[PDB]
Structure 1
C-alpha cells in the first residue's frame, strides 16, 4: 500500500510514450531499469586502511544499506596492491529503494552540482547503460557534510533492459536525467 514517485510515473506515462515511439509487438520488450550500482575506489588502501571505513560510513548514510567491501583478487605490486587488500566499497540497489534513490539524486544533489551544464549522452555502452562519476560527496544532504575529512568520490552506473543507446537515452529522458539535449 504505497508507491514511489518515479515508479508510479514509470507505470503511467513513460511506458506509454516509449510504446508510441518504438512500436513494440509485445510490451515485454518495453525497456525497464533493473538496478542501480554504486562504487568507491579508495585506492590508498596501502596508505590509509581507515578511509575504507570512512567510505563505508558515508555510503551507509547515503543509501541506507551496509556496503560490500570488494577485495583485490590479483596482487599488482606497482601500486602496493596485494591479494585481499580492500580497495573499494560497492552497493547494489533494487526496487522501491532504488526509485527513491533516483528521486533524491535527481531532485536534491544533481541540482546541487557546481555549474552543472549537463551529463553527457555518451556515457552509455552497447545498449544504454549510463556510467557516470562524482568527484566529491559534498552534495548529499543525507551526508553530514561537516565531519568529512577528505574528498571520497564515487562512480555510479545505471543498467537497463534497453537494447540500444537510442532507447536508453529516450527512457532516461522520460525519467528525467538532465542529459545535454543535443
Structure 2
C-alpha cells in the first residue's frame, strides 16, 4: 500500500512579482537555472496597462534542484499551519511555493487517458505537515 502513498516534492516555484527585470539574475543564482518572464493580464492604474509585458519572473525546480534549494529556503522560514494548502501545499517568503503530492500524479498531467486525482488519493494539509516536518524542521 504505502511507498506509493507517501508524499514527495513536485516542483518548487520561486517567483518575484515585481511591477515592471534585473531581478532574474538573483533568481538564477538562488536556484540554479534560467528564470522565466511573467507577462500580465488586464490594463490597470498602477501604470500597468500593457498586456504582454515583463512584470516579474519565476523558476520551477524539480527533483534535486528543488531539494538543494529547500535545504536553505525552509530554514529561512518559520511559519506553518493555516498557511498550508487544502491539497497539502504551502507558500512562504520573493515567494517560494512547494507543491506536494503522491506517486500517481502523472495520471492527471499526461496527454493520453489523463484523469483527475481522486479526493482520497489527494494530499491533505496534515499528511503534508508530517512529511515535511519529518525533514529538517518543525510545524507550527
Q: TM-score, normalised by structure 1?
A: 0.60
Q: Is the 8 A contact 1:56 1:67 kept in 2?
A: yes
State the Cα RMSD in Å: 1.8
CA distance in 1, matches of 2:99, 2:90: 7
Deviation of residue 106 (structure 1)? Answer: 4.0
Runs of 4+ that moved beyond 4 A: none
CA offsets 1:11-30 (integer angstroms, 9 cap, x no match): xxxxxxxxxxxxxx343121
Structure 2 residue corresponding to 1:31, chosen from 1, 4, 7: 7
Number of aligned positions between the proteins: 119
Structure 2 residue corresponding to 1:126, chosen from 86, 89, 100: 86
Inter-CA distance 94–76: structure 2 relative to 1 (3 Å threshold) = same
Instruction: Point out the structure with the larger helix share.
Output: 1
Instruction: Flag the structure with larger Rg.
Output: 1
CA distance in 1, matches of 2:11, 2:42: 30
Q: TM-score, normalised by structure 2?
A: 0.76
Please, which runs of 5 or more residues in structure 1 have no aligned partner? 1-24, 46-51, 111-115, 134-153
Please, which runs of 5 or more residues in structure 2 have no aligned partner? 103-122
Q: Is the 8 A contact 1:119 1:178 kept in 2?
A: no
CA offsets 1:52-101 (integer angstroms, 9 cap, x no match): 12x111111211111001111x2322222211121110000011121111
CA distance in 1, matches of 2:24, 2:90: 24
CA distance in 2, matches of 1:85, 1:104: 31
